[PDB]
Design a protein around this ligand. Structure first.
Ligand SMILES: N[C@@H](CC(=O)O)C(=O)O
Ligand SMILES: N[C@@H](CC(=O)O)C(=O)O
Ligand SMILES: N[C@@H](CC(=O)O)C(=O)O
Ligand SMILES: [Hg+2]
Ligand SMILES: [Hg+2]
Ligand SMILES: [Hg+2]
Ligand code: NA
Ligand code: NA
Ligand code: NA
Ligand code: NA
Ligand code: NA
Ligand code: NA
Lengths: 404, 404, 404
């Protein structure tokens, strides 16, 4: 723990004062592979640790639960993200980012995006080669197969024969072995988190960061201080009502938060998030369902970033942002949040479609050269949103746990 | 059984009178994903269910079964297919389709087709990375690896050490744990089958079907009544002679036919064709070899299709059918029946080579004017031809089971 | 074994005399499958045999060993390679291949090869999706995951709960079943190895071989009499020094030296080399490590091929080869040896980059007009070179194990 915190501070404040000194492209040839090494070795775990812990997590009460508890949190995930965009727009009207007239014109970003198929992405939730999907990544058709297997072995320990139930105990206990084998490594990769972390911010400061000034200084304030409010106004209040101690939650989830802010992957944070929930006394049927579906649908941090930026660009050109009917951001930023992907960046590239709905496309060359000011400093605002993106799952995971 | 017939007859009558009204592209975005939701769930099962029932399929008598019964089933397959094409000819010689001059000229199909290397597919029958080949569909190199491991485990249960035989007895009972667990899901997807087999056949009557008139009407009868003879002349005359009852047969095999007729996917209908054989007291060492090979090599209904169509297209111009030297269609159609793929569509697109053989290519852009009208009602003849394709499997899979 | 020799002698001698009668493109479309059918069946095994024997090999003493060894073997590999290239020079300095002055000019090879990323390959040593790496070949990140597994099960067989270890033991024991079952086939594929051997070198004599004369005949000496030395000089001299009887070593490693010479794949040999290593009685947690890492780092044979050919080209035109300052071959070629792949061809295509170090690039249309003579007999020097590449692995695997 302490080596991570001592590594994180002196890391950024080593890499910050090399950025003002023109060593951006030397902190690349030195510091930014060790941060990948930390990344790779978290990504290596993700596939077995989700599959084993989810064939085991269908051994507990099979109907309801994985469909009554699963619907509990479905109500939670939409309301949390729904409120997060209300917070971030009110923060962009308590602040005012965009008083300087958008400087450069030219160099337009993309334009002919196509999406969604919509129907043939809901059907792509159900796999065909259970072995293929499981071999690509695919952290959501892999879940669906695991639960439908785990139920099938529950009913198989009920049949009259012994050699029926005597091969099913073999199977399921063997798969349980890997489950234990995969939490077992996940702290032996934690291991090297101090030096991993020291690297990761040492870079993301020299290349972008020694950069923040002006109205980009005003907007970074409205991102972080808007994000602060989500932690202590929505979580420390909903944990406080639902029995659980506020501080005992954050004393335990500290090791998953740090590997979310520093890493910016929600997806490659997930084995260490899965362990932290076993550390605080959660039964498998809940957490190894609500965390993998959670790190792809509950995007609380992204909803505030997507709300506050679809307002910085309205101010930067001078659009009146609809006096009353700006709630058409409130529907779109939720529908973008659930859309938004795991790996870093993709929170902003889906910010494209929430600008599109209220009425400013990136075809217009002076809208999307002023989008180039924000996309210049994206990774900085990604560290922040990713922390809330991943803590918002864990908050609901234990608040649905102590209900059913 | 009942809601499948209730759903089938009122599926094919509801969509039928929506297809004389131009709602072809409307059933498209309403009743077409519901038929696919049923297909995807079935194709999900095909991959472990063939692997698990195959490691245990070489649990019982090792050579001579997969050895002398692996020769019996072969002789059965080449002869049921060759009788079938001849039965299609004297159907196109009792009915006569192709009177009028094939109307338009232009818009011709693909014309340079390469393959087969032949030598370089028979070597392709033996895999290199079993873990990937099994992750890539591949229901014929995956069968080779699954037998060859089962022989190995039989020989290890013979070793004198009790940590040689005490580690085999885990692996082999664990794989059986899936084989049981897989057949358990194979009815859980058959639950939704009425709504799946209301949605599929509702579509194949909206687009296409409300199209069968004129010359195509005369050939559609000469396909379906040719498909009737194979049932009550080759199955119901050979099932009768070999002990087993012909009426106890359709009492059991009417759970894979209904699926096969409607899906039109032989390889996507194998998991439930694998089960209805365990339902009627067929031992493992037979049915997990004689069906996966049967669902790609015994194409009984296609031989009759490629038989009758390689005669409609000769009639549509007027070529004299070779009045004495027409027995070279019969060799190509068998060598095309064995060639023809698992999934839908690939029968008529294989017809390319049996037309080519006798004289008339599809490069000639007046042959391709009449092929375009057959390929305009392919999906209707696709339903019937598939049912005899996978009935001729279950026919042999029970007759050869009662001899060895 | 006697059938490999009776198949090998009149194997080459049968293929040879047909080559003087222009059946080059006739022995291609008749004999060369059966060689490949032997290759495919061996390459079938490489995947499970290197995965299983390597999880269980991490079950044996965990720190040091896989940490003290693998520091032992590593150094031995470097000093064998570095010796062999210097054995290579003083064989081409001992002969002198290259009096003929390059005949024509033209018909150039590739020229630009990009790579090395250099660091983004030492990072791709650690996998992401274990289930695909494994399903892709990849026998070095697959090594890395497996060692990291057995080390997790060791601790897991050390837990105080009889479900924490009563499940973990079941896992390791089913993985053990496959392990044993994979070796069990590796002589049942070593079965048809006399028709395997005869077909293979039947080809390699018809299309190439009937070419060797001139200074090609001269160089074909220095290469073969160089490789002869490395064994009865660095092995029969390091086996004698380290206990282990020489003549017993070559008695046992017979059925992996013939499978290596005839295949010319270091990768495609290994399952039946791993087995010979189990035969002489080496420990799991040694050979399951040292032969995987060895089939791609230790290339004693290619170290000699390269050294002698970076020298044929120099004489071919008539440069000095730098009078003393030539050991800039020795650093590069060992850096090139460790680079060189496991499948055939890769040696001479790497020989490029070492020639590029002494200052004769392949772009030069009279430089690589001599290089297209040496590629024209490369499958012939491949066989000799491959035998030493795999012998040098087994020699070290042995010496190292009798130390620790
Ligand atoms: N980095 C975010 C995704 C995003 O909004 O870009 C996450 O991992 O949750
Ligand atoms: N749809 C057919 C294949 C074909 O087109 O002939 C089947 O499943 O058997
Ligand atoms: N064929 C060689 C590699 C090479 O040098 O080309 C081997 O298998 O070791
Ligand atoms: Hg689960
Ligand atoms: Hg089988
Ligand atoms: Hg190992
Ligand atoms: Na998302
Ligand atoms: Na999230
Ligand atoms: Na068939
Ligand atoms: Na076929
Ligand atoms: Na080697
Ligand atoms: Na090498």
């Amino acid at each position: 723990l302490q080596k991570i915190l001592i590594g994180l501070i002196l890391g950024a404040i080593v890499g910050l004062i090399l950025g003002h000194y023109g060593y951006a492209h030397a902190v690349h040839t030195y510091v930014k592979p060790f941060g990948d090494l930390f990344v790779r070795l978290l990504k290596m775990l993700v596939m077995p640790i989700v599959f084993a812990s989810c064939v085991v997590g269908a051994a507990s009460i099979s109907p309801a639960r994985l469909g009554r508890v699963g619907v509990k949190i479905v109500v939670y995930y939409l309301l949390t993200s729904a409120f997060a965009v209300t917070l971030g727009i009110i923060m962009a009207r308590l602040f005012n980012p965009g008083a300087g007239i958008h400087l450069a014109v030219g160099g337009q970003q993309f334009q002919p995006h196509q999406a969604p198929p919509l129907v043939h992405i809901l059907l792509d939730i159900v796999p065909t080669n259970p072995f293929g999907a499981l071999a690509n990544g695919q952290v959501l058709p892999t879940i669906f197969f695991a639960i439908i297997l785990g139920i099938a072995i529950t009913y198989l320990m009920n049949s009259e024969n012994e050699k029926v139930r005597k091969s099913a105990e073999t199977l399921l206990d063997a798969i349980n072995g890997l489950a234990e084998a995969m939490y077992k490594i996940v702290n032996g990769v934690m291991q090297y988190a101090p030096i991993g972390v020291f690297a990761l911010i040492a870079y993301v400061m020299a290349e972008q960061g020694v950069h923040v000034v002006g109205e980009l200084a005003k907007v970074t304030a409205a991102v972080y201080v808007g994000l602060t409010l989500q932690i202590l106004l929505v979580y420390f209040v909903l944990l406080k009502i639902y029995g659980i101690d506020p501080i005992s939650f954050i004393k335990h989830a500290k090791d998953a938060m740090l590997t979310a802010f520093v890493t910016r992957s929600s997806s490659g944070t997930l084995p260490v998030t899965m362990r932290v929930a076993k550390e605080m006394g959660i039964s498998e049927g809940i957490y190894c369902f609500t965390l993998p579906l959670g790190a792809t649908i509950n995007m609380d941090g992204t909803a505030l970033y997507q709300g506050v930026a679809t307002f910085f660009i309205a101010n930067a050109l001078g659009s009146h942002l609809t006096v009353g009917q700006q709630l058409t951001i409130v529907l779109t930023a939720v529908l973008a949040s659930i859309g938004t992907a795991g790996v870093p960046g993709a929170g902003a590239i889906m910010l494209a479609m929430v600008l599109h709905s209220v009425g400013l496309p990136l075809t217009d060359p002076n809208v999307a050269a002023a989008y180039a000011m924000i996309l210049g400093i994206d990774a900085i605002l990604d560290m922040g949103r990713t922390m809330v993106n991943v803590t918002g799952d864990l908050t609901g995971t234990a608040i649905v746990a102590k209900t059913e």
